Amino acid sequence: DSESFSVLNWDQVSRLHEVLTEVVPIHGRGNFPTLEITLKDIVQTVRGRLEEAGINVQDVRLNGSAAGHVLVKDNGLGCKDLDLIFHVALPTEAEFQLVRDVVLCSLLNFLPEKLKISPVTLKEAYVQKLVKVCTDTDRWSLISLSNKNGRNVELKFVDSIRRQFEFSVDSFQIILDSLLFFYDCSGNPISEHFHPTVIGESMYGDFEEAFDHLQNRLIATKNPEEIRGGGLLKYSNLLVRDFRPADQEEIKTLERYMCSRFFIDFPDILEQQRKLETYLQNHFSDEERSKYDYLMILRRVVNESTVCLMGHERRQTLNLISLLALRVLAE
Ligand SMILES: [Cl-]
């Protein structure tokens, strides 16, 4: 109900406007130039061309750390990743290809003025990753832009997705539809005296409770059973950023559960290595000290919250953590 929603104030709406209008460079591989895009322009292009092609855009939302930064300035979670969500129905395969073609066309809008241009070519030049699932329980397409700039622009087109786990401070989404309608129809720039009503939502459950957690830098969750192997990595990211567990005397039980879930999802040691290496690159680029501190946090949780039955997995994972941290110190 309304307990998960909240109305943004001018301070939050203003920072939302800066995030959507910030010029973000998108690195181009090869002879391709860097695209200077804004979240506002790419949303308007994608949503316009989607609805023009028969795909109704139910709503557009800002997700991730950016949504947290709009609610609380400099909360400690950073502002690298710009995550966008497009609630669109994807019944058949043709809708999935249409979503890709519209995104690649949106990149063509920012391409300045000799190169060969095509959908296959634009994907190679600017799309960092493109994952796609198409089952009865999950139907969503994700397109990420090149992150050699340092920032991660993710375009997530969700039809239906079973709820993913995140802590309170990472569960904020900002519905942009009222502000996008304002961008198209306003004759004056957005101001304190004239600005639309922007709504934020916490997928955690209670906005005020989650908002208080972000204001006091607290680690909390109400659905621990939905935690999978990645939960240990999200929890360690909050710890390295000076977020304290909001419920002491309970974190020991939660840390043990997160280590067990980590080992169940990643039994192979070579699988844990590739998961950490890609995690250290997509979260702590140009932050070698943060790479070391994150691994040392991860070592402390694994060393103190792994049961006696899994001593093999504990020693094996602790050794991998040390060798990854040693390679950071070796450079
Ligand atoms: Cl998880």
Side-chain angles (χ1 to χ4, degrees):
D1 295 325
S2 61
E3 59 268 341
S4 61
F5 296 97
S6 178
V7 180
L8 273 63
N9 57 47
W10 167 237
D11 171 68
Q12 297 163 330
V13 171
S14 179
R15 245 179 297 111
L16 174 65
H17 178 62
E18 161 73 301
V19 172
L20 298 185
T21 59
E22 177 182 352
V23 179
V24 180
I26 303 300
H27 172 67
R29 278 170 275 183
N31 276 260
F32 280 72
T34 57
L35 308 176
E36 300 194 35
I37 80 174
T38 68
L39 294 185
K40 165 180 173 295
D41 293 325
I42 191 172
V43 164
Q44 292 180 333
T45 296
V46 167
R47 184 174 75 164
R49 298 168 82 106
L50 273 178
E51 294 179 349
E52 165 185 305
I55 295 185
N56 174 36
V57 179
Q58 303 179 13
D59 53 302
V60 183
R61 301 187 175 196
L62 179 71
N63 184 22
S65 55
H69 178 79
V70 168
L71 299 179
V72 176
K73 177 188 299 180
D74 301 335
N75 52 28
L77 298 184
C79 303
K80 282 188 175 182
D81 297 1
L82 304 172
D83 302 317
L84 292 167
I85 301 178
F86 296 83
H87 282 98
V88 293
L90 306 180
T92 71
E93 165 63 30
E95 284 78 357
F96 283 88
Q97 183 65 29
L98 201 155
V99 164
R100 170 195 287 182
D101 294 334
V102 164
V103 170
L104 296 176
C105 282
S106 65
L107 305 179
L108 180 63
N109 189 29
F110 303 98
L111 207 152
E113 304 189 25
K114 298 184 176 183
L115 306 169
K116 48 173 182 57
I117 305 306
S118 80
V120 179
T121 299
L122 289 175
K123 194 200 70 176
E124 146 75 8
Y126 301 111
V127 174
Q128 181 64 75
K129 92 176 77 67
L130 199 155
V131 304
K132 165 192 174 183
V133 293
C134 183
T135 173
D136 295 74
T137 181
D138 275 3
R139 269 185 168 177
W140 54 269
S141 181
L142 180 142
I143 305 178
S144 300
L145 302 184
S146 58
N147 67 331
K148 191 46 67 186
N149 161 45
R151 316 195 69 181
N152 304 271
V153 180
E154 285 194 1
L155 307 184
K156 200 167 187 176
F157 300 79
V158 299
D159 178 16
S160 63
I161 180 172
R162 37 193 165 97
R163 57 180 319 276
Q164 307 150 127
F165 163 75
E166 267 292 351
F167 293 96
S168 302
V169 299
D170 303 322
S171 69
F172 292 116
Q173 297 177 9
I174 303 170
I175 305 179
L176 306 178
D177 291 64
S178 66
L179 184 54
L180 300 169
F181 171 78
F182 182 82
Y183 286 145
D184 297 323
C185 294
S186 178
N188 302 336
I190 180 174
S191 66
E192 168 159 69
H193 297 355
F194 193 69
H195 66 271
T197 302
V198 181
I199 305 299
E201 181 182 8
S202 177
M203 318 306 296
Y204 159 80
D206 189 79
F207 186 95
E208 293 294 332
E209 183 176 351
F211 182 81
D212 182 77
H213 294 160
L214 185 62
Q215 215 166 357
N216 296 319
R217 295 196 293 182
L218 298 184
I219 298 178
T221 174
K222 269 189 170 60
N223 298 327
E225 67 284 329
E226 302 292 334
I227 297 178
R228 296 309 146 95
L232 179 58
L233 305 189
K234 307 163 186 174
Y235 171 71
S236 303
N237 176 80
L238 294 183
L239 281 183
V240 79
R241 299 178 182 274
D242 299 324
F243 275 59
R244 303 303 203 92
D247 196 325
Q248 279 289 345
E249 309 159 354
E250 193 205 280
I251 197 64
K252 178 57 161 51
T253 307
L254 180 61
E255 285 182 351
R256 288 159 48 193
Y257 182 84
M258 286 183 291
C259 290
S260 292
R261 277 295 190 174
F262 176 85
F263 293 137
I264 288 178
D265 287 2
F266 308 105
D268 188 7
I269 188 62
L270 296 175
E271 188 60 273
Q272 305 180 20
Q273 180 179 349
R274 202 201 318 110
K275 188 63 182 67
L276 296 183
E277 287 170 346
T278 59
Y279 193 98
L280 295 180
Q281 290 290 342
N282 297 334
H283 294 82
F284 303 109
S285 61
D286 294 354
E287 303 191 76
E288 291 290 301
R289 178 67 197 192
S290 295
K291 287 183 177 179
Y292 173 81
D293 292 335
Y294 177 87
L295 292 164
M296 291 300 101
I297 290 292
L298 197 53
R299 168 186 175 85
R300 193 271 299 167
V301 181
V302 170
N303 186 28
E304 296 179 15
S305 307
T306 304
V307 300
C308 299
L309 270 57
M310 311 193 60
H312 173 73
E313 285 84 8
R314 171 186 166 273
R315 297 177 246 100
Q316 192 181 46
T317 295
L318 286 180
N319 189 79
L320 167 65
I321 291 173
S322 295
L323 294 182
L324 288 174
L326 283 171
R327 191 172 59 184
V328 174
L329 303 175
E331 298 300 307

PDB file of all heavy atoms in Angstrom, residues 165 226-232 234, ligand 1:
ATOM      1  N   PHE A 165      16.561  -9.838  -4.013  1.00  0.00           N
ATOM      2  CA  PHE A 165      16.907  -9.393  -2.672  1.00  0.00           C
ATOM      3  C   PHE A 165      17.875  -8.221  -2.716  1.00  0.00           C
ATOM      4  O   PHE A 165      18.833  -8.214  -3.494  1.00  0.00           O
ATOM      5  CB  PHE A 165      17.530 -10.518  -1.845  1.00  0.00           C
ATOM      6  CG  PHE A 165      18.254 -10.021  -0.624  1.00  0.00           C
ATOM      7  CD1 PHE A 165      17.546  -9.577   0.481  1.00  0.00           C
ATOM      8  CD2 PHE A 165      19.639  -9.966  -0.592  1.00  0.00           C
ATOM      9  CE1 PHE A 165      18.205  -9.104   1.601  1.00  0.00           C
ATOM     10  CE2 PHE A 165      20.303  -9.493   0.525  1.00  0.00           C
ATOM     11  CZ  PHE A 165      19.584  -9.060   1.622  1.00  0.00           C
ATOM     12  N   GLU A 226      14.916 -14.760   0.957  1.00  0.00           N
ATOM     13  CA  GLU A 226      15.147 -14.484  -0.454  1.00  0.00           C
ATOM     14  C   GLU A 226      16.614 -14.232  -0.778  1.00  0.00           C
ATOM     15  O   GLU A 226      16.938 -13.989  -1.945  1.00  0.00           O
ATOM     16  CB  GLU A 226      14.301 -13.285  -0.894  1.00  0.00           C
ATOM     17  CG  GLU A 226      12.806 -13.474  -0.675  1.00  0.00           C
ATOM     18  CD  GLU A 226      12.213 -14.542  -1.574  1.00  0.00           C
ATOM     19  OE1 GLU A 226      12.778 -14.787  -2.661  1.00  0.00           O
ATOM     20  OE2 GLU A 226      11.182 -15.137  -1.194  1.00  0.00           O
ATOM     21  N   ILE A 227      17.501 -14.287   0.216  1.00  0.00           N
ATOM     22  CA  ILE A 227      18.920 -14.056  -0.026  1.00  0.00           C
ATOM     23  C   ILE A 227      19.518 -15.263  -0.733  1.00  0.00           C
ATOM     24  O   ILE A 227      19.322 -16.411  -0.312  1.00  0.00           O
ATOM     25  CB  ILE A 227      19.657 -13.772   1.291  1.00  0.00           C
ATOM     26  CG1 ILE A 227      19.131 -12.490   1.936  1.00  0.00           C
ATOM     27  CG2 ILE A 227      21.160 -13.674   1.052  1.00  0.00           C
ATOM     28  CD1 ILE A 227      19.771 -12.170   3.262  1.00  0.00           C
ATOM     29  N   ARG A 228      20.254 -15.008  -1.814  1.00  0.00           N
ATOM     30  CA  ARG A 228      20.991 -16.035  -2.525  1.00  0.00           C
ATOM     31  C   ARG A 228      22.492 -15.753  -2.395  1.00  0.00           C
ATOM     32  O   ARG A 228      22.909 -14.937  -1.562  1.00  0.00           O
ATOM     33  CB  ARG A 228      20.502 -16.098  -3.977  1.00  0.00           C
ATOM     34  CG  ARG A 228      19.047 -16.531  -4.103  1.00  0.00           C
ATOM     35  CD  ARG A 228      18.765 -17.809  -3.314  1.00  0.00           C
ATOM     36  NE  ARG A 228      17.410 -17.810  -2.765  1.00  0.00           N
ATOM     37  CZ  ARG A 228      16.359 -18.375  -3.352  1.00  0.00           C
ATOM     38  NH1 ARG A 228      16.500 -18.999  -4.513  1.00  0.00           N
ATOM     39  NH2 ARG A 228      15.164 -18.318  -2.776  1.00  0.00           N
ATOM     40  N   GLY A 229      23.300 -16.426  -3.221  1.00  0.00           N
ATOM     41  CA  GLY A 229      24.745 -16.359  -3.054  1.00  0.00           C
ATOM     42  C   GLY A 229      25.313 -14.957  -3.150  1.00  0.00           C
ATOM     43  O   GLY A 229      26.313 -14.644  -2.497  1.00  0.00           O
ATOM     44  N   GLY A 230      24.696 -14.098  -3.959  1.00  0.00           N
ATOM     45  CA  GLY A 230      25.170 -12.732  -4.093  1.00  0.00           C
ATOM     46  C   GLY A 230      24.961 -11.867  -2.868  1.00  0.00           C
ATOM     47  O   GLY A 230      25.567 -10.792  -2.785  1.00  0.00           O
ATOM     48  N   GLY A 231      24.130 -12.308  -1.920  1.00  0.00           N
ATOM     49  CA  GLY A 231      23.859 -11.493  -0.747  1.00  0.00           C
ATOM     50  C   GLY A 231      25.102 -11.202   0.072  1.00  0.00           C
ATOM     51  O   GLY A 231      25.235 -10.122   0.653  1.00  0.00           O
ATOM     52  N   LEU A 232      26.030 -12.161   0.128  1.00  0.00           N
ATOM     53  CA  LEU A 232      27.281 -11.936   0.844  1.00  0.00           C
ATOM     54  C   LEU A 232      28.068 -10.787   0.227  1.00  0.00           C
ATOM     55  O   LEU A 232      28.718 -10.015   0.942  1.00  0.00           O
ATOM     56  CB  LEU A 232      28.116 -13.217   0.851  1.00  0.00           C
ATOM     57  CG  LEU A 232      29.475 -13.125   1.542  1.00  0.00           C
ATOM     58  CD1 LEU A 232      29.304 -12.696   2.989  1.00  0.00           C
ATOM     59  CD2 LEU A 232      30.213 -14.450   1.456  1.00  0.00           C
ATOM     60  N   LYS A 234      26.782  -8.184  -1.586  1.00  0.00           N
ATOM     61  CA  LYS A 234      26.089  -6.930  -1.304  1.00  0.00           C
ATOM     62  C   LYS A 234      26.315  -6.494   0.137  1.00  0.00           C
ATOM     63  O   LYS A 234      26.521  -5.306   0.409  1.00  0.00           O
ATOM     64  CB  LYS A 234      24.594  -7.082  -1.586  1.00  0.00           C
ATOM     65  CG  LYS A 234      24.271  -7.617  -2.968  1.00  0.00           C
ATOM     66  CD  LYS A 234      22.839  -8.118  -3.033  1.00  0.00           C
ATOM     67  CE  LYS A 234      22.542  -8.790  -4.361  1.00  0.00           C
ATOM     68  NZ  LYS A 234      21.187  -9.408  -4.369  1.00  0.00           N
TER      69      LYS A 234
HETATM   70 CL    CL B   1      21.027 -12.519  -3.257  1.00  0.00          CL
END
